[PDB]
Amino acid sequence: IVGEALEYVNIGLSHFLALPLAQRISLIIIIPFIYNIVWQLLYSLRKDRPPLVFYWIPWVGSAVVYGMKPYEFFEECQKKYGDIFSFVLLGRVMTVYLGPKGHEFVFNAKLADVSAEAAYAHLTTPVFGKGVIYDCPNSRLMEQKKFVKGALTKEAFKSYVPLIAEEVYKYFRDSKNFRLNERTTGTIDVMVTQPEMTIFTASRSLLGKEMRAKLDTDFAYLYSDLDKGFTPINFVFPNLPLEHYRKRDHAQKAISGTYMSLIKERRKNNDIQDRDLIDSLMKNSTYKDGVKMTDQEIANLLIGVLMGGQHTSAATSAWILLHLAERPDVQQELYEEQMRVLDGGKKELTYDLLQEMPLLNQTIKETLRMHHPLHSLFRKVMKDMHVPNTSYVIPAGYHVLVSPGYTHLRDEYFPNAHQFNIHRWNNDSASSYSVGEEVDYGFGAISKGVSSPYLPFGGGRHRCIGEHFAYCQLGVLMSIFIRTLKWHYPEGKTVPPPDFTSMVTLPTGPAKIIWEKRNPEQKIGGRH
Ligand code: HEM
Numbered sequence: 001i002v003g004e005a006l007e008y009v010n011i012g013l014s015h016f017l018a019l020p021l022a023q024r025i026s027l028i029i030i031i032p033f034i035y036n037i038v039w040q041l042l043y044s045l046r047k048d049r050p051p052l053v054f055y056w057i058p059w060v061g062s063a064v065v066y067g068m069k070p071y072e073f074f075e076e077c078q079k080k081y082g083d084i085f086s087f088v089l090l091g092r093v094m095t096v097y098l099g100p101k102g103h104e105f106v107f108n109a110k111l112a113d114v115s116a117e118a119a120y121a122h123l124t125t126p127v128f129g130k131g132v133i134y135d136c137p138n139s140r141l142m143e144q145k146k147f148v149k150g151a152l153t154k155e156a157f158k159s160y161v162p163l164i165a166e167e168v169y170k171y172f173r174d175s176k177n178f179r180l181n182e183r184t185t186g187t188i189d190v191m192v193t194q195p196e197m198t199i200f201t202a203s204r205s206l207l208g209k210e211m212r213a214k215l216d217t218d219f220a221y222l223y224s225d226l227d228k229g230f231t232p233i234n235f236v237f238p239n240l241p242l243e244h245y246r247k248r249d250h251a252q253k254a255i256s257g258t259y260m261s262l263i264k265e266r267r268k269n270n271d272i273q274d275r276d277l278i279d280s281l282m283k284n285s286t287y288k289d290g291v292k293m294t295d296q297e298i299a300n301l302l303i304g305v306l307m308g309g310q311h312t313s314a315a316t317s318a319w320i321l322l323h324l325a326e327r328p329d330v331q332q333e334l335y336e337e338q339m340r341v342l343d344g345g346k347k348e349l350t351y352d353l354l355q356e357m358p359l360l361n362q363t364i365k366e367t368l369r370m371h372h373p374l375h376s377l378f379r380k381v382m383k384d385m386h387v388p389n390t391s392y393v394i395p396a397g398y399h400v401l402v403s404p405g406y407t408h409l410r411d412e413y414f415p416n417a418h419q420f421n422i423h424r425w426n427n428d429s430a431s432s433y434s435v436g437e438e439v440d441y442g443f444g445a446i447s448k449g450v451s452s453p454y455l456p457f458g459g460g461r462h463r464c465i466g467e468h469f470a471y472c473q474l475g476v477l478m479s480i481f482i483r484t485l486k487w488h489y490p491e492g493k494t495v496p497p498p499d500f501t502s503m504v505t506l507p508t509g510p511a512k513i514i515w516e517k518r519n520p521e522q523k524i525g526g527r528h
Protein backbone atom coordinates (compact mmCIF):
# COMPACT_ATOMS: atom_id res chain seq x y z
CA ILE A 1 0.00 0.00 0.00
CA VAL A 2 1.43 3.28 -1.26
CA GLY A 3 -1.95 4.98 -0.86
CA GLU A 4 -1.10 5.64 2.78
CA ALA A 5 2.03 7.50 1.64
CA LEU A 6 0.14 9.79 -0.75
CA GLU A 7 -2.09 10.76 2.16
CA TYR A 8 1.07 11.98 3.89
CA VAL A 9 2.07 14.05 0.87
CA ASN A 10 -1.29 15.77 1.30
CA ILE A 11 -0.84 15.95 5.08
CA GLY A 12 2.71 17.25 4.66
CA LEU A 13 1.49 19.94 2.28
CA SER A 14 -1.02 21.05 4.92
CA HIS A 15 1.59 21.04 7.69
CA PHE A 16 3.81 23.05 5.35
CA LEU A 17 1.18 25.74 4.65
CA ALA A 18 0.96 26.18 8.45
CA LEU A 19 4.57 26.63 9.55
CA PRO A 20 5.44 29.77 11.55
CA LEU A 21 6.39 32.78 9.44
CA ALA A 22 9.99 32.36 10.64
CA GLN A 23 10.18 28.82 9.24
CA ARG A 24 8.62 29.73 5.90
CA ILE A 25 10.61 32.78 4.79
CA SER A 26 13.67 30.78 5.81
CA LEU A 27 12.26 28.00 3.63
CA ILE A 28 11.41 30.56 0.93
CA ILE A 29 15.14 31.41 0.83
CA ILE A 30 16.58 27.93 1.22
CA ILE A 31 14.44 26.05 -1.34
CA PRO A 32 15.81 27.91 -4.41
CA PHE A 33 19.32 28.13 -2.92
CA ILE A 34 19.55 24.34 -2.76
CA TYR A 35 17.69 23.82 -6.03
CA ASN A 36 20.12 26.16 -7.80
CA ILE A 37 23.14 24.31 -6.37
CA VAL A 38 21.80 20.90 -7.41
CA TRP A 39 20.76 22.13 -10.87
CA GLN A 40 24.34 23.29 -11.54
CA LEU A 41 25.77 19.92 -10.52
CA LEU A 42 23.30 18.19 -12.84
CA TYR A 43 24.24 20.72 -15.53
CA SER A 44 27.95 19.93 -15.10
CA LEU A 45 27.31 16.48 -16.61
CA ARG A 46 25.66 17.63 -19.81
CA LYS A 47 28.43 17.29 -22.39
CA ASP A 48 26.69 19.37 -25.07
CA ARG A 49 26.98 22.46 -22.82
CA PRO A 50 30.05 24.60 -22.20
CA PRO A 51 31.23 24.52 -18.58
CA LEU A 52 29.13 26.82 -16.40
CA VAL A 53 30.83 29.02 -13.81
CA PHE A 54 29.67 28.05 -10.33
CA TYR A 55 27.68 30.67 -8.39
CA TRP A 56 26.05 30.76 -4.96
CA ILE A 57 23.26 33.35 -5.31
CA PRO A 58 20.43 32.46 -7.72
CA TRP A 59 19.52 34.95 -10.46
CA VAL A 60 22.40 37.28 -9.48
CA GLY A 61 24.98 34.77 -10.67
CA SER A 62 28.53 35.99 -11.27
CA ALA A 63 27.21 39.54 -11.86
CA VAL A 64 29.39 41.11 -9.18
CA VAL A 65 32.81 39.85 -10.25
CA TYR A 66 31.90 40.18 -13.93
CA GLY A 67 30.61 43.73 -13.56
CA MET A 68 33.59 44.90 -11.54
CA LYS A 69 36.58 43.11 -13.14
CA PRO A 70 35.49 41.35 -16.35
CA TYR A 71 39.00 40.70 -17.68
CA GLU A 72 40.17 39.19 -14.38
CA PHE A 73 37.00 37.08 -14.42
CA PHE A 74 37.60 35.90 -18.00
CA GLU A 75 41.21 34.96 -17.26
CA GLU A 76 40.27 32.87 -14.22
CA CYS A 77 37.49 31.15 -16.17
CA GLN A 78 39.90 30.68 -19.10
CA LYS A 79 42.45 28.96 -16.85
CA LYS A 80 39.77 26.62 -15.47
CA TYR A 81 37.58 25.80 -18.48
CA GLY A 82 39.38 27.08 -21.57
CA ASP A 83 38.10 29.55 -24.13
CA ILE A 84 34.35 28.80 -24.08
CA PHE A 85 32.37 28.92 -20.84
CA SER A 86 29.06 30.19 -19.51
CA PHE A 87 28.09 32.22 -16.47
CA VAL A 88 24.83 33.48 -15.02
CA LEU A 89 24.25 37.25 -15.02
CA LEU A 90 21.16 38.88 -13.47
CA GLY A 91 18.76 36.26 -14.80
CA ARG A 92 20.49 35.38 -18.08
CA VAL A 93 23.03 32.80 -19.20
CA MET A 94 25.98 34.38 -21.03
CA THR A 95 28.24 32.09 -23.11
CA VAL A 96 31.70 33.64 -23.48
CA TYR A 97 33.92 32.56 -26.40
CA LEU A 98 37.39 34.06 -25.88
CA GLY A 99 39.97 34.65 -28.59
CA PRO A 100 39.89 35.01 -32.39
CA LYS A 101 37.68 31.92 -32.78
CA GLY A 102 35.22 33.65 -30.46
CA HIS A 103 35.30 36.77 -32.64
CA GLU A 104 34.36 34.62 -35.66
CA PHE A 105 31.68 32.71 -33.76
CA VAL A 106 29.91 35.87 -32.58
CA PHE A 107 30.74 38.73 -34.97
CA ASN A 108 30.34 36.58 -38.09
CA ALA A 109 27.31 34.68 -36.77
CA LYS A 110 24.39 34.15 -39.13
CA LEU A 111 21.65 36.78 -38.99
CA ALA A 112 19.12 34.10 -38.03
CA ASP A 113 21.30 32.64 -35.27
CA VAL A 114 21.78 35.79 -33.16
CA SER A 115 20.15 39.15 -32.50
CA ALA A 116 21.98 42.27 -31.35
CA GLU A 117 18.80 44.32 -30.97
CA ALA A 118 17.30 41.67 -28.69
CA ALA A 119 20.33 42.11 -26.41
CA TYR A 120 20.73 45.89 -26.59
CA ALA A 121 17.31 47.51 -27.20
CA HIS A 122 16.55 47.78 -23.48
CA LEU A 123 19.81 49.65 -22.87
CA THR A 124 19.49 52.02 -25.83
CA THR A 125 15.85 52.55 -26.88
CA PRO A 126 14.94 54.43 -23.63
CA VAL A 127 17.95 56.72 -24.18
CA PHE A 128 17.95 57.34 -27.95
CA GLY A 129 14.24 57.09 -28.79
CA LYS A 130 12.03 54.88 -30.89
CA GLY A 131 12.34 53.55 -34.41
CA VAL A 132 16.15 53.59 -34.77
CA ILE A 133 19.31 51.59 -34.07
CA TYR A 134 18.00 48.68 -31.98
CA ASP A 135 14.27 49.62 -31.98
CA CYS A 136 13.85 48.33 -35.53
CA PRO A 137 14.74 45.24 -37.58
CA ASN A 138 18.36 44.60 -38.53
CA SER A 139 17.69 45.56 -42.15
CA ARG A 140 16.61 49.01 -40.99
CA LEU A 141 19.78 49.37 -38.88
CA MET A 142 21.91 48.31 -41.88
CA GLU A 143 20.51 51.22 -43.90
CA GLN A 144 20.66 53.65 -40.99
CA LYS A 145 24.39 52.88 -40.90
CA LYS A 146 24.61 53.57 -44.65
CA PHE A 147 22.93 56.97 -44.13
CA VAL A 148 25.33 58.00 -41.35
CA LYS A 149 28.41 56.70 -43.18
CA GLY A 150 27.35 59.02 -46.05
CA ALA A 151 28.31 62.09 -44.05
CA LEU A 152 31.52 60.34 -42.91
CA THR A 153 33.48 60.82 -46.12
CA LYS A 154 37.05 61.96 -46.72
CA GLU A 155 35.59 65.22 -48.07
CA ALA A 156 33.56 65.63 -44.88
CA PHE A 157 36.70 64.98 -42.79
CA LYS A 158 38.61 67.64 -44.71
CA SER A 159 35.95 70.16 -43.71
CA TYR A 160 35.68 68.81 -40.14
CA VAL A 161 39.41 69.18 -39.35
CA PRO A 162 39.54 73.02 -39.19
CA LEU A 163 36.20 73.05 -37.29
CA ILE A 164 37.44 70.56 -34.68
CA ALA A 165 40.72 72.51 -34.45
CA GLU A 166 38.78 75.73 -33.82
CA GLU A 167 36.84 74.05 -30.99
CA VAL A 168 40.03 72.72 -29.36
CA TYR A 169 41.65 76.15 -29.48
CA LYS A 170 38.48 77.76 -28.12
CA TYR A 171 38.43 75.23 -25.29
CA PHE A 172 42.09 76.01 -24.50
CA ARG A 173 41.22 79.72 -24.56
CA ASP A 174 37.92 79.83 -22.66
CA SER A 175 37.57 76.76 -20.43
CA LYS A 176 38.32 77.25 -16.72
CA ASN A 177 40.45 74.10 -16.93
CA PHE A 178 42.97 75.88 -19.17
CA ARG A 179 42.67 79.64 -19.98
CA LEU A 180 45.98 79.57 -21.83
CA ASN A 181 46.03 83.36 -22.39
CA GLU A 182 46.07 83.84 -18.60
CA ARG A 183 47.82 80.73 -17.23
CA THR A 184 50.98 78.89 -18.32
CA THR A 185 50.50 75.82 -16.10
CA GLY A 186 47.59 74.12 -14.37
CA THR A 187 46.03 70.90 -13.16
CA ILE A 188 43.09 69.19 -14.89
CA ASP A 189 41.00 66.09 -14.34
CA VAL A 190 40.97 64.40 -17.74
CA MET A 191 37.55 62.91 -16.89
CA VAL A 192 36.27 66.49 -16.75
CA THR A 193 38.06 67.96 -19.78
CA GLN A 194 37.75 65.13 -22.28
CA PRO A 195 33.94 64.69 -22.12
CA GLU A 196 33.59 68.45 -22.69
CA MET A 197 36.14 68.63 -25.51
CA THR A 198 34.60 65.56 -27.10
CA ILE A 199 31.02 66.91 -27.08
CA PHE A 200 32.11 70.38 -28.25
CA THR A 201 34.15 68.97 -31.17
CA ALA A 202 31.61 66.31 -32.18
CA SER A 203 28.67 68.75 -31.95
CA ARG A 204 30.29 71.43 -34.10
CA SER A 205 31.29 68.98 -36.84
CA LEU A 206 28.53 66.37 -36.93
CA LEU A 207 25.56 68.54 -35.78
CA GLY A 208 26.57 72.03 -36.96
CA LYS A 209 27.07 75.49 -35.56
CA GLU A 210 23.52 75.97 -34.21
CA MET A 211 23.63 72.77 -32.15
CA ARG A 212 27.13 73.59 -30.93
CA ALA A 213 25.93 77.06 -29.90
CA LYS A 214 23.27 75.41 -27.71
CA LEU A 215 25.98 73.74 -25.61
CA ASP A 216 26.93 77.22 -24.35
CA THR A 217 23.57 77.41 -22.51
CA ASP A 218 21.51 75.59 -19.87
CA PHE A 219 20.65 73.18 -22.70
CA ALA A 220 24.01 71.46 -22.09
CA TYR A 221 22.61 70.03 -18.85
CA LEU A 222 20.01 68.06 -20.79
CA TYR A 223 22.94 66.24 -22.42
CA SER A 224 24.24 65.41 -18.93
CA ASP A 225 20.79 64.11 -17.93
CA LEU A 226 20.39 62.05 -21.11
CA ASP A 227 23.96 60.79 -20.64
CA LYS A 228 23.10 59.58 -17.12
CA GLY A 229 20.27 57.43 -18.53
CA PHE A 230 22.87 55.43 -20.48
CA THR A 231 23.73 52.89 -17.79
CA PRO A 232 23.93 49.10 -17.28
CA ILE A 233 21.06 49.47 -14.78
CA ASN A 234 18.80 49.80 -17.85
CA PHE A 235 19.45 46.07 -18.47
CA VAL A 236 17.65 45.15 -15.24
CA PHE A 237 15.54 48.25 -14.51
CA PRO A 238 14.97 50.42 -17.61
CA ASN A 239 11.93 52.33 -16.32
CA LEU A 240 11.39 53.14 -12.65
CA PRO A 241 8.98 55.83 -11.41
CA LEU A 242 12.03 57.75 -10.10
CA GLU A 243 13.78 61.04 -10.77
CA HIS A 244 16.82 59.79 -12.70
CA TYR A 245 14.47 58.19 -15.25
CA ARG A 246 12.31 61.31 -15.63
CA LYS A 247 15.14 63.69 -16.52
CA ARG A 248 16.35 61.06 -19.00
CA ASP A 249 13.00 60.81 -20.79
CA HIS A 250 12.59 64.59 -20.57
CA ALA A 251 16.08 65.16 -22.00
CA GLN A 252 15.43 62.75 -24.88
CA LYS A 253 12.22 64.59 -25.78
CA ALA A 254 13.85 68.00 -25.37
CA ILE A 255 17.03 67.19 -27.32
CA SER A 256 15.22 65.35 -30.11
CA GLY A 257 12.81 68.30 -30.15
CA THR A 258 15.70 70.70 -30.74
CA TYR A 259 16.98 68.61 -33.67
CA MET A 260 13.52 68.36 -35.24
CA SER A 261 13.14 72.12 -34.86
CA LEU A 262 16.35 72.60 -36.84
CA ILE A 263 15.38 69.94 -39.39
CA LYS A 264 12.01 71.60 -39.98
CA GLU A 265 13.50 75.12 -40.09
CA ARG A 266 16.05 73.99 -42.69
CA ARG A 267 13.36 72.41 -44.88
CA LYS A 268 11.00 75.39 -44.54
CA ASN A 269 13.84 77.61 -45.85
CA ASN A 270 15.26 75.02 -48.29
CA ASP A 271 18.50 75.61 -46.36
CA ILE A 272 19.76 72.06 -46.92
CA GLN A 273 23.50 72.06 -47.70
CA ASP A 274 26.39 69.62 -47.08
CA ARG A 275 27.54 71.13 -43.79
CA ASP A 276 26.83 68.43 -41.21
CA LEU A 277 25.16 65.10 -40.49
CA ILE A 278 21.75 66.83 -40.23
CA ASP A 279 22.00 68.13 -43.81
CA SER A 280 23.13 64.67 -44.86
CA LEU A 281 20.30 62.68 -43.27
CA MET A 282 17.69 65.18 -44.50
CA LYS A 283 18.90 64.59 -48.07
CA ASN A 284 19.56 60.88 -47.62
CA SER A 285 17.39 58.85 -45.24
CA THR A 286 14.91 56.95 -47.43
CA TYR A 287 14.96 53.18 -47.02
CA LYS A 288 15.17 50.93 -50.08
CA ASP A 289 11.46 50.00 -49.76
CA GLY A 290 10.60 53.71 -50.16
CA VAL A 291 9.73 54.50 -46.53
CA LYS A 292 11.27 57.77 -45.38
CA MET A 293 12.66 58.11 -41.87
CA THR A 294 10.55 60.50 -39.85
CA ASP A 295 11.97 63.70 -38.49
CA GLN A 296 11.68 62.03 -35.08
CA GLU A 297 13.68 59.00 -36.26
CA ILE A 298 16.37 61.20 -37.80
CA ALA A 299 16.65 63.11 -34.51
CA ASN A 300 16.82 59.88 -32.49
CA LEU A 301 19.46 58.41 -34.81
CA LEU A 302 21.53 61.58 -34.28
CA ILE A 303 21.30 61.14 -30.50
CA GLY A 304 22.45 57.53 -30.57
CA VAL A 305 25.32 58.17 -33.01
CA LEU A 306 26.49 61.26 -31.08
CA MET A 307 26.23 59.51 -27.73
CA GLY A 308 28.01 56.34 -28.88
CA GLY A 309 30.85 58.38 -30.32
CA GLN A 310 30.84 60.55 -27.20
CA HIS A 311 31.69 57.75 -24.77
CA THR A 312 34.21 55.79 -26.87
CA SER A 313 36.13 58.91 -27.96
CA ALA A 314 36.14 60.73 -24.62
CA ALA A 315 37.35 57.62 -22.84
CA THR A 316 40.07 57.17 -25.44
CA SER A 317 41.51 60.70 -25.38
CA ALA A 318 41.52 60.42 -21.58
CA TRP A 319 43.63 57.24 -21.74
CA ILE A 320 45.96 58.78 -24.34
CA LEU A 321 46.70 61.79 -22.10
CA LEU A 322 47.09 59.47 -19.11
CA HIS A 323 49.60 57.17 -20.86
CA LEU A 324 51.52 60.05 -22.34
CA ALA A 325 51.64 61.82 -18.95
CA GLU A 326 54.30 59.34 -17.75
CA ARG A 327 56.02 59.12 -21.18
CA PRO A 328 57.81 62.41 -21.91
CA ASP A 329 59.90 60.43 -24.43
CA VAL A 330 56.74 59.63 -26.43
CA GLN A 331 55.51 63.25 -26.18
CA GLN A 332 58.93 64.35 -27.49
CA GLU A 333 58.82 61.89 -30.39
CA LEU A 334 55.26 63.00 -31.25
CA TYR A 335 56.29 66.66 -31.06
CA GLU A 336 59.13 66.06 -33.56
CA GLU A 337 56.66 64.43 -35.98
CA GLN A 338 54.36 67.46 -35.64
CA MET A 339 57.30 69.76 -36.44
CA ARG A 340 58.38 67.75 -39.49
CA VAL A 341 54.93 67.14 -40.99
CA LEU A 342 53.68 70.69 -40.39
CA ASP A 343 56.91 72.57 -41.27
CA GLY A 344 57.58 73.72 -37.73
CA GLY A 345 53.95 74.77 -37.30
CA LYS A 346 53.87 76.91 -40.45
CA LYS A 347 51.45 74.51 -42.20
CA GLU A 348 47.84 74.51 -41.08
CA LEU A 349 46.70 71.04 -40.05
CA THR A 350 44.54 69.36 -42.74
CA TYR A 351 42.97 65.92 -43.00
CA ASP A 352 45.65 64.95 -45.55
CA LEU A 353 48.48 65.97 -43.22
CA LEU A 354 46.90 63.93 -40.39
CA GLN A 355 47.43 60.84 -42.57
CA GLU A 356 51.17 61.66 -42.73
CA MET A 357 51.47 61.46 -38.91
CA PRO A 358 52.08 57.72 -38.37
CA LEU A 359 53.34 57.94 -34.77
CA LEU A 360 50.30 60.00 -33.69
CA ASN A 361 47.98 57.49 -35.32
CA GLN A 362 49.95 54.60 -33.76
CA THR A 363 49.49 56.24 -30.36
CA ILE A 364 45.71 56.17 -30.88
CA LYS A 365 45.95 52.58 -32.18
CA GLU A 366 47.99 51.52 -29.13
CA THR A 367 45.62 53.21 -26.69
CA LEU A 368 42.73 51.41 -28.33
CA ARG A 369 44.65 48.17 -27.87
CA MET A 370 45.25 48.60 -24.15
CA HIS A 371 41.94 50.34 -23.45
CA HIS A 372 39.26 48.98 -25.74
CA PRO A 373 36.33 51.19 -24.67
CA LEU A 374 33.76 48.33 -24.70
CA HIS A 375 34.87 45.29 -22.75
CA SER A 376 31.89 43.14 -23.84
CA LEU A 377 29.75 42.93 -26.95
CA PHE A 378 26.55 40.86 -26.72
CA ARG A 379 24.02 39.01 -28.85
CA LYS A 380 20.93 37.02 -27.92
CA VAL A 381 20.97 33.50 -29.36
CA MET A 382 17.83 32.99 -31.46
CA LYS A 383 18.47 29.45 -32.78
CA ASP A 384 20.45 26.62 -31.18
CA MET A 385 24.07 27.00 -32.28
CA HIS A 386 26.69 24.28 -32.60
CA VAL A 387 30.23 25.34 -31.68
CA PRO A 388 32.53 23.95 -34.43
CA ASN A 389 35.06 21.28 -33.41
CA THR A 390 33.23 20.72 -30.13
CA SER A 391 30.10 18.91 -29.01
CA TYR A 392 28.78 22.15 -27.47
CA VAL A 393 25.35 23.47 -28.37
CA ILE A 394 24.40 27.00 -27.29
CA PRO A 395 20.58 26.87 -27.06
CA ALA A 396 18.23 29.62 -28.12
CA GLY A 397 17.57 31.97 -25.19
CA TYR A 398 21.21 32.07 -24.18
CA HIS A 399 23.36 35.08 -24.98
CA VAL A 400 26.82 35.06 -26.55
CA LEU A 401 29.49 37.49 -25.36
CA VAL A 402 32.64 38.42 -27.26
CA SER A 403 35.53 40.46 -25.82
CA PRO A 404 38.22 41.51 -28.28
CA GLY A 405 39.48 43.94 -25.63
CA TYR A 406 40.51 40.86 -23.63
CA THR A 407 42.55 39.43 -26.52
CA HIS A 408 44.20 42.85 -26.97
CA LEU A 409 45.74 42.19 -23.56
CA ARG A 410 47.10 38.66 -24.23
CA ASP A 411 50.89 38.30 -24.47
CA GLU A 412 50.52 35.57 -27.12
CA TYR A 413 49.03 38.03 -29.60
CA PHE A 414 50.74 41.22 -28.40
CA PRO A 415 54.16 40.62 -26.81
CA ASN A 416 54.46 42.46 -23.48
CA ALA A 417 50.77 43.27 -23.76
CA HIS A 418 50.65 45.34 -20.57
CA GLN A 419 53.37 47.69 -21.85
CA PHE A 420 52.27 50.83 -23.71
CA ASN A 421 54.45 50.75 -26.86
CA ILE A 422 53.37 52.69 -29.94
CA HIS A 423 56.29 51.22 -31.88
CA ARG A 424 54.70 47.79 -32.01
CA TRP A 425 52.68 49.47 -34.84
CA ASN A 426 55.67 50.68 -36.94
CA ASN A 427 54.76 50.42 -40.64
CA ASP A 428 51.23 49.49 -39.50
CA SER A 429 49.58 52.73 -38.39
CA ALA A 430 46.18 52.24 -40.05
CA SER A 431 43.16 52.31 -37.76
CA SER A 432 42.30 48.81 -39.05
CA TYR A 433 43.11 46.68 -42.09
CA SER A 434 40.91 44.15 -43.90
CA VAL A 435 43.40 41.31 -44.32
CA GLY A 436 41.62 39.70 -47.29
CA GLU A 437 38.19 39.16 -48.78
CA GLU A 438 35.48 41.74 -48.20
CA VAL A 439 31.71 41.62 -47.74
CA ASP A 440 29.00 44.31 -47.77
CA TYR A 441 26.01 44.06 -45.39
CA GLY A 442 24.36 47.26 -46.55
CA PHE A 443 26.70 50.00 -45.33
CA GLY A 444 29.81 49.35 -47.42
CA ALA A 445 32.45 46.70 -48.10
CA ILE A 446 34.14 45.54 -44.89
CA SER A 447 36.41 42.64 -43.97
CA LYS A 448 34.83 39.21 -44.36
CA GLY A 449 37.12 37.61 -41.80
CA VAL A 450 36.96 38.85 -38.23
CA SER A 451 39.85 36.76 -36.91
CA SER A 452 42.30 39.61 -36.38
CA PRO A 453 43.45 39.55 -32.72
CA TYR A 454 43.22 43.37 -32.87
CA LEU A 455 39.53 44.19 -33.34
CA PRO A 456 38.83 47.54 -31.70
CA PHE A 457 35.86 48.26 -34.03
CA GLY A 458 34.29 44.78 -33.98
CA GLY A 459 33.33 43.16 -37.24
CA GLY A 460 30.54 41.72 -39.29
CA ARG A 461 27.15 43.34 -39.75
CA HIS A 462 27.34 45.29 -36.46
CA ARG A 463 30.83 46.67 -37.16
CA CYS A 464 31.56 50.27 -36.20
CA ILE A 465 31.15 52.97 -38.82
CA GLY A 466 32.73 55.65 -36.65
CA GLU A 467 36.38 54.65 -36.81
CA HIS A 468 37.53 57.26 -39.31
CA PHE A 469 35.59 59.99 -37.54
CA ALA A 470 37.12 58.91 -34.25
CA TYR A 471 40.65 58.97 -35.69
CA CYS A 472 39.98 62.38 -37.27
CA GLN A 473 38.66 63.84 -34.00
CA LEU A 474 41.30 62.20 -31.77
CA GLY A 475 43.98 63.10 -34.32
CA VAL A 476 43.15 66.82 -34.49
CA LEU A 477 42.75 66.97 -30.71
CA MET A 478 46.04 65.19 -29.96
CA SER A 479 48.02 67.05 -32.63
CA ILE A 480 46.97 70.31 -30.92
CA PHE A 481 47.59 69.00 -27.40
CA ILE A 482 51.11 67.90 -28.41
CA ARG A 483 52.02 71.11 -30.18
CA THR A 484 50.62 73.32 -27.37
CA LEU A 485 51.39 71.56 -24.09
CA LYS A 486 53.64 69.23 -22.19
CA TRP A 487 52.04 67.40 -19.28
CA HIS A 488 52.94 65.02 -16.45
CA TYR A 489 51.57 63.39 -13.28
CA PRO A 490 51.35 64.88 -9.80
CA GLU A 491 54.03 63.42 -7.54
CA GLY A 492 53.67 59.68 -7.11
CA LYS A 493 50.62 59.30 -9.41
CA THR A 494 50.46 56.91 -12.35
CA VAL A 495 48.03 55.48 -14.91
CA PRO A 496 44.81 54.72 -13.02
CA PRO A 497 43.20 51.28 -13.33
CA PRO A 498 40.02 51.03 -15.41
CA ASP A 499 36.51 51.36 -14.05
CA PHE A 500 34.55 48.70 -15.94
CA THR A 501 31.21 49.21 -14.16
CA SER A 502 30.04 51.86 -16.66
CA MET A 503 30.40 49.18 -19.43
CA VAL A 504 32.72 51.79 -20.98
CA THR A 505 36.22 51.08 -19.65
CA LEU A 506 36.84 54.53 -18.19
CA PRO A 507 39.84 55.57 -16.13
CA THR A 508 39.09 55.58 -12.43
CA GLY A 509 38.81 59.24 -11.49
CA PRO A 510 39.93 61.67 -10.48
CA ALA A 511 42.69 61.13 -13.04
CA LYS A 512 44.69 64.34 -12.81
CA ILE A 513 47.54 65.61 -14.98
CA ILE A 514 49.58 68.80 -14.80
CA TRP A 515 49.96 70.71 -18.06
CA GLU A 516 52.29 73.51 -19.02
CA LYS A 517 52.57 75.65 -22.11
CA ARG A 518 55.38 74.84 -24.54
CA ASN A 519 55.27 78.53 -25.51
CA PRO A 520 54.20 80.41 -22.34
CA GLU A 521 53.76 83.62 -24.40
CA GLN A 522 51.59 82.10 -27.16
CA LYS A 523 48.16 83.71 -27.30
CA ILE A 524 44.95 82.35 -28.80
CA GLY A 525 43.01 85.00 -30.73
CA GLY A 526 39.28 85.53 -31.19
CA ARG A 527 36.56 87.17 -29.11
CA HIS A 528 35.33 86.06 -25.66
C1 HEM B 1 37.49 54.75 -30.35
C2 HEM B 1 36.31 54.91 -30.94
C3 HEM B 1 35.33 53.73 -31.14
C4 HEM B 1 35.43 52.42 -30.85
C5 HEM B 1 36.61 51.65 -30.22
C6 HEM B 1 34.18 51.79 -31.25
C7 HEM B 1 33.85 50.46 -31.14
C8 HEM B 1 32.74 49.87 -31.70
C9 HEM B 1 32.46 48.45 -31.68
C10 HEM B 1 33.36 47.40 -31.01
C11 HEM B 1 31.30 48.23 -32.32
C12 HEM B 1 30.62 46.86 -32.53
C13 HEM B 1 29.45 46.73 -31.56
C14 HEM B 1 28.88 45.33 -31.52
O1 HEM B 1 29.32 44.43 -32.30
O2 HEM B 1 27.96 45.11 -30.69
C15 HEM B 1 30.81 49.51 -32.77
C16 HEM B 1 29.64 49.71 -33.47
C17 HEM B 1 29.13 50.93 -33.85
N1 HEM B 1 29.66 52.16 -33.53
FE1 HEM B 1 31.56 52.48 -32.73
N2 HEM B 1 33.36 52.76 -31.78
C18 HEM B 1 34.03 53.96 -31.74
C19 HEM B 1 33.56 55.18 -32.17
C20 HEM B 1 32.35 55.41 -32.77
C21 HEM B 1 31.91 56.68 -33.31
C22 HEM B 1 32.79 57.96 -33.24
C23 HEM B 1 30.66 56.49 -33.81
C24 HEM B 1 29.73 57.51 -34.52
C25 HEM B 1 30.18 58.66 -35.02
C26 HEM B 1 30.29 55.10 -33.62
C27 HEM B 1 29.10 54.50 -33.99
C28 HEM B 1 28.88 53.14 -34.08
C29 HEM B 1 27.76 52.49 -34.75
C30 HEM B 1 26.63 53.24 -35.50
C31 HEM B 1 27.91 51.15 -34.62
C32 HEM B 1 26.98 50.05 -35.20
C33 HEM B 1 26.29 49.19 -34.15
C34 HEM B 1 25.48 48.10 -34.81
O3 HEM B 1 25.53 47.94 -36.06
O4 HEM B 1 24.79 47.34 -34.08
N3 HEM B 1 31.35 54.47 -32.98
N4 HEM B 1 31.71 50.50 -32.37
Ligand SMILES: C[C@@H](c1ncncc1F)[C@](O)(Cn1cncn1)c1ccc(F)cc1F
Binds near residue numbers: 308
Ligand atom coordinates in the same frame (compact mmCIF):
# COMPACT_ATOMS: atom_id res chain seq x y z
C1 LIG C 1 25.37 49.52 -27.71
C2 LIG C 1 26.60 50.33 -27.25
C3 LIG C 1 27.44 49.55 -26.27
N1 LIG C 1 27.83 50.20 -25.16
C4 LIG C 1 28.53 49.51 -24.26
N2 LIG C 1 28.91 48.24 -24.31
C5 LIG C 1 28.55 47.57 -25.40
C6 LIG C 1 27.81 48.20 -26.42
F1 LIG C 1 27.50 47.46 -27.51
C7 LIG C 1 27.44 50.83 -28.45
O1 LIG C 1 28.01 49.75 -29.20
C8 LIG C 1 28.64 51.63 -27.91
N3 LIG C 1 29.37 52.28 -28.99
C9 LIG C 1 30.06 51.73 -29.98
N4 LIG C 1 30.52 52.65 -30.79
C10 LIG C 1 30.07 53.79 -30.22
N5 LIG C 1 29.37 53.63 -29.13
C11 LIG C 1 26.64 51.72 -29.40
C12 LIG C 1 26.55 51.36 -30.74
C13 LIG C 1 25.88 52.16 -31.65
C14 LIG C 1 25.31 53.32 -31.21
F2 LIG C 1 24.68 54.12 -32.11
C15 LIG C 1 25.37 53.73 -29.90
C16 LIG C 1 26.03 52.91 -29.03
F3 LIG C 1 26.08 53.29 -27.73
